[PDB]
Every structure is written in structure tokens, then in C-alpha cells.
Amino acid sequence: MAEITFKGGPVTLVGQEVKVGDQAPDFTVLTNSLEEKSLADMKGKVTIISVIPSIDTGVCDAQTRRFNEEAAKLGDVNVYTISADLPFAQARWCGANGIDKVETLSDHRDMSFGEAFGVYIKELRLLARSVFVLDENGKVVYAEYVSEATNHPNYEKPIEAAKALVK
């Protein structure tokens, strides 16, 4: 189970607990440029996806920044950071600053990724704090939901999962 806490309050997820091997549905997301992109546009290469409620939340610094920076060096992998619409959350791309390969995404506009990966928080209506790695067909090769959204996962584990493919 992929239930989480946010600020020390438990909160439920809508479409729950994707896991390794479960495959990814194909939904749509928006870019930082507000263009429609789908999972099918990511397919054809190994892909890495961080998910955060906002970037103002400081989780930028502690892990997402670093994880993305490492991810971008494993190889030519796609790297993404999905955020809420929330104004605090796309301006500044703490994950996508200095690593031009990273792009910030705005799923909350359509919630399609939110529902499809079950990271839409039922109680809070935010993107969950989560991290995923996908094979070239879009098959999830890592998934994690951080037990507290204001906290961060061990980021080596998705890096190893990505290494295991890229190599």
C-alpha cells in the first residue's frame, strides 16, 4: 500500500500502488510550455520520473535536484519532474536547473497521470511525492511512494533500476 502522510496527516491515493512490471496506461501530461505530451512520447527510451506536490516545498533541494542530476548522467535517459499546477511549483524547476535534459510537467491540469499512476491524492488533491523508472516500452521498472510527502526516498534505488536498463 501506497498511502502516504502529508505534514504529519495521513492521506489516501485515488488509483494507488503501481509496481514494477505492472505497465503504465498511456495518459497525457502538460509540459512547462503547456503543450500536451503523453507517455507514448516518452516511450522509445529509458525514462525517469520524479513527482512532487510543489517545488516551493524544499524537497527540490534534499533529493530531487540530486537524483535528476545523477539520472541525466547515467545515459541519454529521459528525465521529468511532474508537479501540481499550483503557482509555486513550475516556476523554478529545482530539478531542471543546470541539467537541460530535465523538463518540468504539469499533470494536475487533466490529472490523467495523477489517476493513472494513482499519485492523485484523494484527500489533498495534490500530486503525491513519488519516483518511477520506465523501460523503453513504458513498463515501470521502479515505483515508490514516500511514506511522508514532505520527506524524500532513497534515490540510489531508482538510479540502480535505471542503470540496470541503460547499461
Side-chain angles (χ1 to χ4, degrees):
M1 253 212 291
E3 180 173 277
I4 65 174
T5 314
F6 186 102
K7 275 193 212 191
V11 292
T12 314
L13 270 18
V14 177
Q16 316 188 302
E17 200 195 297
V18 230
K19 60 199 59 163
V20 75
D22 194 65
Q23 241 311 5
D26 199 279
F27 40 68
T28 318
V29 281
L30 238 54
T31 58
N32 170 71
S33 318
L34 303 164
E35 300 186 70
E36 296 170 344
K37 174 186 190 65
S38 2
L39 176 72
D41 180 69
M42 310 178 185
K43 296 188 202 191
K45 197 163 10 169
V46 179
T47 293
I48 294 171
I49 308 182
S50 295
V51 191
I52 54 179
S54 296
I55 68 127
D56 177 78
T57 40
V59 278
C60 286
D61 170 62
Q63 169 271 306
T64 314
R65 171 78 210 257
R66 179 46 158 187
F67 164 78
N68 259 343
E69 181 187 47
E70 282 311 310
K73 305 190 247 184
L74 303 183
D76 189 37
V77 293
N78 301 321
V79 264
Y80 294 115
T81 302
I82 302 179
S83 305
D85 183 308
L86 200 84
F88 294 109
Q90 297 213 0
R92 291 194 60 303
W93 47 58
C94 23
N97 182 242
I99 36 267
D100 182 70
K101 295 170 65 70
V102 183
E103 175 83 27
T104 6
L105 269 59
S106 336
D107 170 63
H108 183 40
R109 214 158 186 128
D110 192 267
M111 280 315 334
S112 285
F113 181 105
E115 203 177 90
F117 274 51
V119 291
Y120 179 26
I121 304 167
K122 197 190 326 178
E123 289 318 77
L124 193 59
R125 305 173 146 177
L126 271 197
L127 276 304
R129 182 71 170 114
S130 328
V131 57
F132 303 94
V133 181
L134 283 83
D135 166 77
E136 307 191 313
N137 321 231
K139 188 161 87 176
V140 272
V141 112
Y142 191 88
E144 177 67 295
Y145 299 93
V146 199
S147 323
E148 167 95 343
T150 36
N151 156 66
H152 60 104
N154 179 301
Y155 71 69
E156 310 177 72
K157 305 190 106 157
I159 289 292
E160 294 185 279
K163 287 180 180 181
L165 294 179
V166 163
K167 218 197 81 200

